[PDB]
Design a protein around this nucleic acid. Structure first.
Lengths: 248, 248
DNA sequence: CTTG
DNA sequence: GAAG
DNA sequence: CTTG
DNA sequence: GAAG
């Protein structure tokens, strides 16, 4: 089966990802920026108990680490933790937005390629490491009142809510999939951050190409959702569109 | 004096005007218009007693007359009577606006002409007769509760609040002053509806021209305010501007 | 939480 | 006077 | 009166 | 949600 044939490529069986070929990312600040430390708004016990198992898992995975940083931004409960990084985003140097919009991305799908595989990369941003010099930027406070732990944590991987994460991830995955494109010139591969479409001319080519892509992704340290995968179908949902008979 | 030398031209001594050379005006309606009869909002006794002497004077002068009309628009007290003619204005055919704006009008004042007379025509619109076919358009209700008179009145002269009155008056006065301009080619005469500026090169020319203009205006049936007149001055107020040394 |  |  |  |  697709599950047991590629255990490394699936998030369900391969563990948390880590893009081993990508250097830890340095995040340049604007020329005038200095650290901003925003106080954490007091969190209700209900919210803290909701957030706590997520924090603990991320600590166990090494995605969060303790730190002392002159930067601090608040967490809010939404229960899953959401960090308000807007004041960090204002202080980070802008980069050119290179992710194409879906309309233009789908214009590269020719009618000759009507067999599709759609993969969704799980925890994609967390596969990209942050350089230790840039980790303090993303610090937040974590207090366990009944555990006597009050201090800061920060991210060792590209965080959610950071304005440049989608673009940096898309660029990284393009670098890591460049060779795959060269080895498979007959395949169409569309990338939209963590959402991938592979298109082939026949079911057999789509099966062979999907095998190669899963092998490559897992080897590089990325992880796809086996639950969401649409493998070798002539009809797929991709980026809000239904792809069918070369339409949409 | 200027007062006693031209008794016909001044409103103070010449009676209410009447432009005897101008045919009574016919007011064309839009192609689809039918009469509109708006009910009179009840008027307080204080307002009615304030308005009443004005109505009576206008009746005595023949400027208002009794009528029965399928048109009716309301009076409001402001105490002087103000008629809301907006629903009549909507039904009257539009005419080209030919009154120049003051900025452009004053561009025709050359620096060689620095002696000024400014005249203000009193009750200017009321000098222009309305044709009997057009009088019913402007009817309103007048009730004297302690006199047992409830019926409509209307205007026999061009009314205040009618959208085309300024343009029709300006055009009429231009027709009536055309010959004066020909007989006095050295004088500058600016007309802005009822506000007139005569400009001359010398005090003597301004005196002679102002004498001729007053004679002509009074003969034609127009009336100027002796109280407001600025006669043969090198500094005058005209249309919100102070005219001085060829400036403004 | 704050930032038609 | 919806989004981080 | 009604029509920033 | 100033003007006739």
């Amino acid at each position: 089966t697709w599950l047991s044939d590629f255990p490394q490529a699936w998030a369900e069986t391969g563990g948390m990802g880590l893009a081993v070929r990508q250097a830890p990312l340095i995040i340049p600040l604007k020329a005038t920026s200095t650290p901003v430390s925003i106080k954490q708004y007091p969190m209700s016990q209900e919210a803290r108990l909701g957030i706590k198992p997520h924090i603990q898992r991320l600590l166990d995975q090494g995605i969060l680490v303790p730190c002392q940083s002159p930067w601090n931004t608040p967490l809010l409960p939404v229960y899953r933790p959401v960090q308000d990084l807007r004041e960090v985003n204002k202080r980070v140097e802008d980069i050119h937005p290179t992710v194409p919009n879906p309309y233009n991305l789908l214009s590269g799908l020719p009618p000759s390629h009507q067999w599709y595989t759609v993969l969704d990369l799980k925890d994609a941003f967390f596969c990209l490491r942050l350089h230790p010099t840039s980790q303090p930027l993303f610090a937040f406070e974590w207090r366990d009142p009944e555990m006597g732990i009050s201090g800061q944590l920060t991210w060792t991987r590209l965080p959610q809510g950071f304005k440049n994460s989608p673009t940096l991830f898309d660029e990284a995955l393009h670098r890591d999939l460049a060779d795959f494109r060269i080895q498979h010139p007959d395949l169409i591969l569309l990338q939209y951050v963590d959402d991938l479409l592979l298109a082939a001319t026949s079911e057999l080519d789509c099966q062979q190409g999907t095998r190669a892509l899963l092998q490559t992704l897992g080897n590089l340290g990325y992880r796809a959702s086996a639950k969401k995968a649409q493998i070798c179908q002539k009809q797929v949902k991709y980026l809000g569109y239904l792809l069918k008979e070369g339409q949409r």
